Structure formats: structure tokens, C-alpha cells
Symmetry: C2
Subunit: 65 residues, 2 copies
């Protein structure tokens, strides 16, 4: 048997975080109070602008529907 | 770049076909007027009962959302 996974590449979008949030790539704070970084619209990964260049494109999540 | 695909295993359900439908595995008609075969709830593959055990479990389709 297998989980069903959605498998593609990240789709990052600039995001306003309402609480202090860290980069899921590098571990440093997403600095500031607005437009602090990017969130993948598919898997929710949060990254700095600079870290968008550094993450693997692979984007997977388990479909729990 | 990558398509987004849903990737899991088939989820076959006994199906009452309304029009003449063929087995996507073996090519023979799904005989009868009711419960003629099984349809995968995820990818739509149609199979005879006997062909359910002959198909690969792999079930993928492109997410066009
Ligand atoms: Zn992602
Ligand atoms: Zn970072
Ligand atoms: Zn399937
Ligand atoms: Zn068949």
C-alpha cells in the first residue's frame, strides 16, 4: 500500500507573517513585520528570498483528503 | 520545472457502467449491465474483477487544478 502524495516543484509566494517565523531552509528569523519571506503555496515551506535559490525544487506533501 | 502529479496506489471501486466500457488493462468489454468492473476513484482506470490483480498498483495523474 502507499500514501498518496502530491509531487511537484515548489511554488513560492511573498508572504506577510503575523508572528515571528523562521526560514525552513537556514533556520534564521524571517526578519521584519511584513513581506518577510516566501511561503510555498503547495507545501507551506517558508524561506528567505535568498534561500529560495538554495532549496531543492522537490515539493511533496501527503494528501490527507 | 515539473508537473504536479498525484502519486499513490489505485483505489478500485465496483462500478455500474452506463455505456459499453472496455477494460483498460486487457481490452475486453466489461460485460453485463451492472457491476461490470471496477473504476479507480483516483485516476479513473476501468478494470475487470479478474484484471484488478494483474495491473500494477502504481496510480498517477497530473494535477490540473
Ligand atoms: Zn513546496
Ligand atoms: Zn533562510
Ligand atoms: Zn488509479
Ligand atoms: Zn480485463
Amino acid at each position: 500500500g502507499s500514501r498518496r502524495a502530491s509531487v511537484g516543484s515548489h511554488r513560492f509566494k511573498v508572504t506577510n507573517y503575523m508572528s515571528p517565523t523562521f526560514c525552513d531552509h537556514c533556520g534564521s528569523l524571517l526578519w521584519g513585520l511584513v513581506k518577510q519571506g516566501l511561503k510555498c503555496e503547495d507545501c507551506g515551506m517558508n524561506v528567505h528570498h535568498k534561500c529560495r535559490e538554495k532549496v531543492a525544487n522537490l515539493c511533496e506533501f501527503i494528501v490527507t483528503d
